[PDB]
C-alpha cells in the first residue's frame, strides 16, 4: 500500500501547522451578543414536508420543493406563490434557483435532475432538459450558470453537466458512501462535497479529481457551505457538531459543539459577513453559532418539526428556514 | 400608485388561481395512500381497492445502504416489508433491517406490514440441507406451535411451526420497544399481487382509524 508513511507525513504536516489556532486568537474579540430573531413572515401553503429550498439572486423570490410533488416559488416581500410546478416524481430531495432566474432545477429520488424553464415565451412552465445518468438518488444540485449544473448523487459521485446537451461533462468520483450536501465557491471554480463518510472533499470543476480531502467529523455529513471569503467552509454532520475547515490550512480550525445537543445538524449556512453561522438541527431549532468564538448566540425555535433546509439571502437581509411541517419561515 | 397596483393585482390574481389549483390538488393528495416496498437487505405502481388510490413506491434503483434515503418515507402511511423465509442467511439480515426500521428516530411513527414470501419454498428448504432453519436458529429446535391458532389446511405441522416461529420472532422484535404510532401487521403469502391488495387495504384502513383515534386521544 505504501500510504501509511504518507498518512504519517500528512498528519505531521497538519500537526506542525496546528499552533496558535483561532480558538485562542479570538479571545480578545468582543462577543456579538444575544441576537433577537423574529419570524417576519410564514410562507404556509405546502402540503407535504418541505424538504429543500434555495434563494434567488434578487433576494426576493425563493424556491421551495416539498415531498407532495410540488415546487413553489414564493415572493417573500409580498408572500405570493408566483409559480406552482407539478412534479412528475413526488419524492424530491433538492432544488436550486438559477442565478439569472431563468431556470429552476429539481432533483429527487427518481435519480433524475429536471430543469424547469420559468419565463420562456409561453406563459406556462415546462421542462427544458431532463438530465439522467446517475444511478443513486440526487441529494443536492446547484446552478453554476444557465449553461452548466453541478449535482451530487447517492452513488458516491458528483456530475457536472451541460444542460443544452444533457451529457456528463465531468464526473467527480472518489467518495465513499452517499453524498449528501453540495456547495459552490464564489468564484464557481472549486466546490466542496460532503458524503456519508465523515469526509469533505474539495474538487475542481475544470479537472475532475479530488483536489483536497478534509476529515475531522465522526459520522455522516449532512450539510456544507463555503465561507463568503471562499478560503474556508463549514460542515454540519450527524455528530451533533459543526466544524469550520480551511482550504489553505488543510485541517480543522474550530468545532461548534455543545453539551446538551444530542441532535445531528441537518442544514448549515453562513451570513453575509460570515460572522454568524446558522445551523438547523434535528431538535426542531436553528442555532446561530458565533463563527469566531464558537459560542451559541441565538435560537430560532419557530418550527414544530425538524428543519430540512436553511437559506440566507445574497444581500444578507433575511434568513429563510424550511421544516418538515410544510411551513417555511422568514427571520430577520 | 396605480403603476404598481396594476402588477400587484396581477400577482394577486396569479396567487388566487395558484391557491385554487393547490386546493384542488390537496383533495386528491390527502385521498391517496402512499406506500413503500422493500425486500430483504419500475419505480411506482398505482392501483385502487374499494375506490381508494394506493401509490406503492418500489425502490430498488438505489444502492444497498439505506440510512439516508429511507427517512423520506417517514410520512408513508404503511411500509410494506417482504421477507424471503427460504434463507444464505437472508432471514437474519431481514430481521436486523426490520429492527433498524422499527427503532428508527424518524420511522418510529410509521406502521409496518410484513409479507413472509417464499412460503412454499421453505417446505423443501427445511429438508434440502443447504440452509437449515433448525441449524441457523437452534432455539427453533425446542420451539413448538405457540398457541392453538388454526393454520391453513393441507400442510405439514413442521412448515407451519417454522412460519409461526418466524412470525413470533418478528413480533418479538417489534414489541420490544413500542413508542409511537408504529404497529406491525404480519401476514402469510406465497405470491404478491394476488389477493394481497385486500389485506394491504384492510391494514391501511386500520392504521388510519388508529391514527384518528390517537388524534382524539381515545386510544
Amino acid at each position: 500500500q505504501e500510504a501509511e508513511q504518507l498518512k504519517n507525513q500528512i498528519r505531521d504536516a497538519r500537526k506542525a501547522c496546528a499552533d496558535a489556532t483561532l480558538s485562542q486568537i479570538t479571545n480578545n474579540i468582543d462577543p456579538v451578543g444575544r441576537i433577537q430573531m423574529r419570524t417576519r413572515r410564514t410562507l404556509r401553503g405546502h402540503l407535504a414536508k418541505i424538504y429543500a429550498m434555495h434563494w434567488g439572486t434578487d433576494s426576493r423570490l425563493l424556491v421551495s420543493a416539498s415531498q407532495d410533488g410540488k415546487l413553489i416559488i414564493w415572493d417573500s416581500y409580498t408572500t405570493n406563490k408566483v409559480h406552482a410546478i407539478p412534479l412528475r416524481s413526488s419524492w424530491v430531495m433538492t432544488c436550486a434557483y438559477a442565478p439569472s432566474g431563468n431556470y429552476v432545477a429539481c432533483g429527487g429520488l427518481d435519480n433524475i435532475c429536471s430543469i424547469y424553464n420559468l419565463k420562456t415565451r409561453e406563459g406556462n412552465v415546462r421542462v427544458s432538459r431532463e438530465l439522467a445518468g446517475h444511478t443513486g438518488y440526487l441529494s443536492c444540485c446547484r446552478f453554476l450558470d444557465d449553461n452548466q449544473i453541478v449535482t451530487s448523487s447517492g452513488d458516491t459521485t458528483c456530475a457536472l453537466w451541460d444542460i443544452e446537451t444533457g451529457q456528463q461533462t465531468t464526473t467527480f468520483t472518489g467518495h465513499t458512501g452517499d453524498v449528501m450536501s453540495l456547495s459552490l465557491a464564489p468564484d464557481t471554480r472549486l466546490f466542496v462535497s460532503g458524503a456519508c463518510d465523515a469526509s469533505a472533499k474539495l474538487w475542481d470543476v475544470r479537472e475532475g479529481m479530488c483536489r483536497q480531502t478534509f476529515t475531522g467529523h465522526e459520522s455522516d455529513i449532512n450539510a456544507i457551505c463555503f465561507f463568503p471569503n471562499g478560503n474556508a467552509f463549514a460542515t454540519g454532520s450527524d455528530d451533533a457538531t459543526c466544524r469550520l475547515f480551511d482550504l489553505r490550512a488543510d485541517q480543522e480550525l474550530m468545532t461548534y459543539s455543545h453539551d446538551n445537543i444530542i441532535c445531528g445538524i441537518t442544514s448549515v449556512s453562513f451570513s453575509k459577513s460570515g460572522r454568524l453561522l446558522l445551523a438547523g438541527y434535528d431538535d426542531f431549532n436553528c442555532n446561530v453559532w458565533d463563527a469566531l468564538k464558537a459560542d451559541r448566540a441565538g435560537v430560532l425555535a419557530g418550527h414544530d418539526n425538524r428543519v430540512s433546509c436553511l437559506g440566507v439571502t445574497d444581500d444578507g437581509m433575511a434568513v429563510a428556514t424550511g421544516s418538515w411541517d410544510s411551513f417555511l419561515k422568514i427571520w430577520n | 400608485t396605480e403603476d404598481q397596483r396594476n402588477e400587484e393585482k396581477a400577482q394577486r390574481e396569479a396567487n388566487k388561481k395558484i391557491e385554487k389549483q393547490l386546493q384542488k390538488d390537496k383533495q386528491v393528495y390527502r385521498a391517496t395512500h402512499r406506500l413503500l416496498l422493500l425486500g430483504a437487505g419500475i419505480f411506482e405502481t398505482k392501483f385502487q381497492v374499494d375506490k381508494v388510490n394506493f401509490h406503492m413506491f418500489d425502490v430498488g434503483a438505489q444502492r444497498d445502504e439505506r440510512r439516508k434515503w429511507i427517512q423520506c418515507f417517514n410520512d408513508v402511511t404503511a411500509i410494506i416489508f417482504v421477507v424471503a423465509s427460504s434463507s444464505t442467511n437472508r432471514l437474519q439480515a431481514a430481521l436486523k433491517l426490520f429492527d433498524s426500521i422499527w427503532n428508527n428516530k424518524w420511522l418510529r411513527d410509521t406502521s409496518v406490514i410484513l409479507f413472509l414470501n417464499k412460503q412454499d419454498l421453505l417446505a423443501e428448504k427445511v429438508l434440502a440441507g443447504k440452509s437449515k432453519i433448525e441449524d441457523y436458529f437452534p432455539e427453533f429446535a425446542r420451539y413448538t406451535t405457540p398457541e392453538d391458532a388454526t393454520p391453513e389446511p393441507g400442510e405439514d405441522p413442521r412448515v407451519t411451526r417454522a412460519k409461526y416461529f418466524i412470525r413470533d420472532e418478528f413480533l418479538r422484535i417489534s414489541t420490544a420497544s413500542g413508542d409511537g404510532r408504529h404497529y406491525c401487521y404480519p401476514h402469510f403469502t406465497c405470491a404478491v399481487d394476488t389477493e394481497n391488495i385486500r389485506r394491504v387495504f384492510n391494514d391501511c384502513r386500520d392504521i388510519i382509524q388508529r391514527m384518528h383515534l390517537r388524534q382524539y386521544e381515545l386510544l
Partner: nanobody
Amino acid sequence: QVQLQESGGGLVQPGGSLRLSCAASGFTFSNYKMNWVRQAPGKGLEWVSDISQSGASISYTGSVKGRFTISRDNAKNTLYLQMNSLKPEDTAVYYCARCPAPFTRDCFDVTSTTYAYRGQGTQVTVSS
C-alpha cells in the same frame, strides 16, 4: 479520522478458542453501538453480534449464540470478542463495525459496499 484497527485471528484448530481485539480511534467510543460482521469465502457479509454503548442489550446471531461473547472497555476504548468451540464453517473474515448513529439504537451496517465505518477486518481459519 474514523479508524478501526483489528488484531488477533489466525489459524486455530477446530473446537479451540480465539480472541479478537478492535481498537477504535477518532471518535467517542462510549457513544456508539458496536457490531461484528463476518464474511465467509464466496458468501455475503452477515451480522454476528451487537453490543450497546455500555452494554445492556447484547445480541448474537442464532448460529453462534452461546459460543461467542462480546465485551467493550470504554476507558481503554476497545472491543473484545471471545470465540469458543470453533467450527470449520466459522472460518471467515471478521470486521468490527461502528454503525453511525450516536445515542440511538438504529443503524444499518451490513452492506457489502464501501462502508465507511467498518475496519479492514482480520482472517480466522479452522484447520483439520
